[PDB]
Structure 1
Amino acid sequence: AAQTNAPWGLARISSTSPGTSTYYYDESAGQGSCVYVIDTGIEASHPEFEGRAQMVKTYYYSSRDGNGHGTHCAGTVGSRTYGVAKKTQLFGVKVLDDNGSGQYSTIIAGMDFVASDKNNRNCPKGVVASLSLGGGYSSSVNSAAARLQSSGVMVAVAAGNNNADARNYSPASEPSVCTVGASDRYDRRSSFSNYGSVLDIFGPGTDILSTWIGGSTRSISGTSMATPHVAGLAAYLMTLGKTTAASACRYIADTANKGDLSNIPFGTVNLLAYNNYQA
């Protein structure tokens, strides 16, 4: 299929050259898959989700997205106009407060929650988790993500916006999950994106149009924004039977656009997420 005038990131995913504006994808659109967005929540009433989004867990006085960041990332996973996997099911887990902050004890608790909760849900195509969050190095936080991955969930986590090596941030430094760097519409590494050998893949991360709270939209930047591109894609392909939860990250890196980004330091992969859908 084709989405004319789509956000530059959606077009990037579907293309082998930057600067295009149509996002080509298989009409299956993540149907039968599920993606957990572990963040500040999701505004599930937003028409862009079409009734496919729902909250399933909060750790605060309200399960409402009082910030928009969780709603933004979910829009990149599966909203109709801004999402990669437009027919996927979205489940919100609010581990971050409305200022975007959250304790590690809560995020850990949130990841353990998803590993058990996928057992109440119908996801015959499989399960993905998008974690646009992180902090300084924590072994318990890294182990939390690896458990979620081992439990049968495709975990994609953001590399960090510190313009440094992601080895000193978590869950970014956990080797078994998928650690996403950010790029811009000119195929440069985003000026903020962390780098390093722990990185597995790059996704669109600078000036990303998506949903926002209040029935609205806006453009923001961060590796928080690239993570849901990779999360949607995994779910897309899993529905297509091309890959499974345990192997999606390797598949995406194996089938990415190689050597195409500028300002990738030595030791960091040069791989841009790509759906290789030949229409």
Structure 2
Amino acid sequence: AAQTNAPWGLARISSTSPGTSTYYYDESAGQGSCVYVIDTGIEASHPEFEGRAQMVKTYYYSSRDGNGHGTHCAGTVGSRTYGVAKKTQLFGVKVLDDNGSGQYSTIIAGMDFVASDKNNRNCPKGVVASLSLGGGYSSSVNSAAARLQSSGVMVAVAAGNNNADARNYSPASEPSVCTVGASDRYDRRSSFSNYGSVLDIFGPGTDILSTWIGGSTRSISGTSMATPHVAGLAAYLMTLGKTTAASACRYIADTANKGDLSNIPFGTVNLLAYNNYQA
């Protein structure tokens, strides 16, 4: 399958050079997999989700995304026009308020909910969790993320947006999850993107067009945009059967585009997420 005039990040996922605009992918498109978007919520009514998005848990009075951050992130996972896995099932877990701010107790409880909820969901191809959030170092937050991964969920987390070593951030510093940095359309590490040995993969993160609340669209930047590229890629590759939740992060890193990004400091992987499209 091919999507012409795709967002540059989607085209980058299937290409071996910057500056293309057509996204090539297998028709399976992540159908049969599930991605939990742990964020401000998901506007499930957005026509770009085609009914494949639903809110399953909120730690606030409403389950609605009153901010837009979570809807944008979920759009990059599996929206029709802006998603990597255009046929996956999206589940919304609202751990961030409508200001985009989270809590220690709610974010930790949210990861516990996903591991307990996935049983009763139809996800024959596997379960993924996308965490476009982060904070200071916390062994508790790291332990909660590792426990979600050990439950049988591919956990992708954002590295952070402070141009700093992600070792001092959680859950970015948890080794057992997949920590994602951001790149720009010119294959340079995004000016804001965190780095460090704890990073596993890079994804498109600068000027990422995706869904927004009110049935609209918006282009924003951050490692919060790069993480759903990797979460959608994992769900796509798990549906294809070439990896599972336990092996997806290493498999993505093993099959990534190597050494093509610029301004990658020594000690940080030079790997860009790549679907290795087999026509």
TM-score (norm 2): 1.00
Deviation at 1:278, TM superposition (A): 2.4
Aligned to 2:231: 231
Deviation at 1:188, TM superposition (A): 0.4
The runs of at least 4 consecutive aligned structure 1 residues that moved more than 2 Å come to none
Query: What secondary structure, in the 3-state scheme, does the structure 1 residue paired with 2:41 have?
Result: coil
Structure 1 CA distance, aligned partners of 2:278 and 2:197? 31
Structure 2 CA distance, aligned partners of 1:6 and 1:53? 21
Q: Deviations over 1:40-82 (max 9, x none)?
A: 0000000000000000000001111000000000000000000
Query: What secondary structure, in the 3-state scheme, does the structure 2 residue paired with 1:130 have?
Result: strand
Deviation at 1:198, TM superposition (A): 0.1
Deviation at 1:104, TM superposition (A): 1.0
Structure 2 CA distance, aligned partners of 1:151 and 1:41? 22
Structure 1 CA distance, aligned partners of 2:174 and 2:47? 35
Aligned to 1:76: 76
* Equivalences, count: 279
Structure 2 CA distance, aligned partners of 1:129 and 1:163? 24
Q: Deviations over 1:232-253 (max 9, x none)?
A: 0000000000000000000000
Query: What secondary structure, in the 3-state scheme, does the structure 2 residue paired with 1:21 have?
Result: coil
Structure 2 CA distance, aligned partners of 1:45 and 1:15? 32
Query: What secondary structure, in the 3-state scheme, does the structure 1 residue paired with 2:239 have?
Result: helix
Q: Deviations over 1:200-250 (max 9, x none)?
A: 000000000000000000100000000000000000000000000000000
Structure 2 CA distance, aligned partners of 1:278 and 1:30? 15
Structure 1 CA distance, aligned partners of 2:175 and 2:241? 24
Q: Deviations over 1:109-134 (max 9, x none)?
A: 00000000001101000000000000
Q: Deviations over 1:163-212 (max 9, x none)?
A: 00000000000000000000000000000000000000000000000000
Aligned to 2:41: 41
Structure 2 CA distance, aligned partners of 1:20 and 1:104? 40
Q: Which runs of 5+ in 1 are unaligned?
A: none
Structure 2 CA distance, aligned partners of 1:255 and 1:17? 15
TM-score (norm 1): 1.00
Query: What secondary structure, in the 3-state scheme, does the structure 2 residue paired with 1:75 have?
Result: helix
Deviation at 1:157, TM superposition (A): 0.1
Map of 1:3-152 to 2, 5 A cutoff?
A: 3-152=3-152
Structure 2 CA distance, aligned partners of 1:103 and 1:48? 29
Structure 1 CA distance, aligned partners of 2:13 and 2:66? 29
Query: What secondary structure, in the 3-state scheme, does the structure 2 residue paired with 1:9 have?
Result: helix
Structure 1 CA distance, aligned partners of 2:134 and 2:84? 23
Query: What secondary structure, in the 3-state scheme, does the structure 2 residue paired with 1:56 have?
Result: strand
Structure 2 CA distance, aligned partners of 1:51 and 1:143? 33
Structure 2 CA distance, aligned partners of 1:224 and 1:122? 26
Structure 1 CA distance, aligned partners of 2:104 and 2:174? 15
Structure 2 CA distance, aligned partners of 1:199 and 1:161? 13
Aligned to 2:214: 214
Instruction: Give the % identical residues.
Output: 100
Structure 1 CA distance, aligned partners of 2:52 and 2:202? 27
Query: What secondary structure, in the 3-state scheme, does the structure 1 residue paired with 2:18 have?
Result: coil
Structure 1 CA distance, aligned partners of 2:145 and 2:93? 15
Q: Deviations over 1:101-155 (max 9, x none)?
A: 0111110000000000001101000000000000000000000000000000000
Structure 2 CA distance, aligned partners of 1:50 and 1:240? 21
Q: Which runs of 5+ in 2 are unaligned?
A: none
Query: What secondary structure, in the 3-state scheme, does the structure 2 residue paired with 1:128 have?
Result: strand
Deviation at 1:12, TM superposition (A): 0.2
Structure 1 CA distance, aligned partners of 2:161 and 2:137? 14
Deviation at 1:16, TM superposition (A): 0.3
Over aligned residue pairs, what C-alpha RMSD do you find?
Answer: 0.4
Structure 1 CA distance, aligned partners of 2:28 and 2:40? 28
Query: What secondary structure, in the 3-state scheme, does the structure 1 residue paired with 2:261 have?
Result: coil
Query: What secondary structure, in the 3-state scheme, does the structure 1 residue paired with 2:37 have?
Result: strand
Query: What secondary structure, in the 3-state scheme, does the structure 2 residue paired with 1:108 have?
Result: helix
Aligned to 1:159: 159
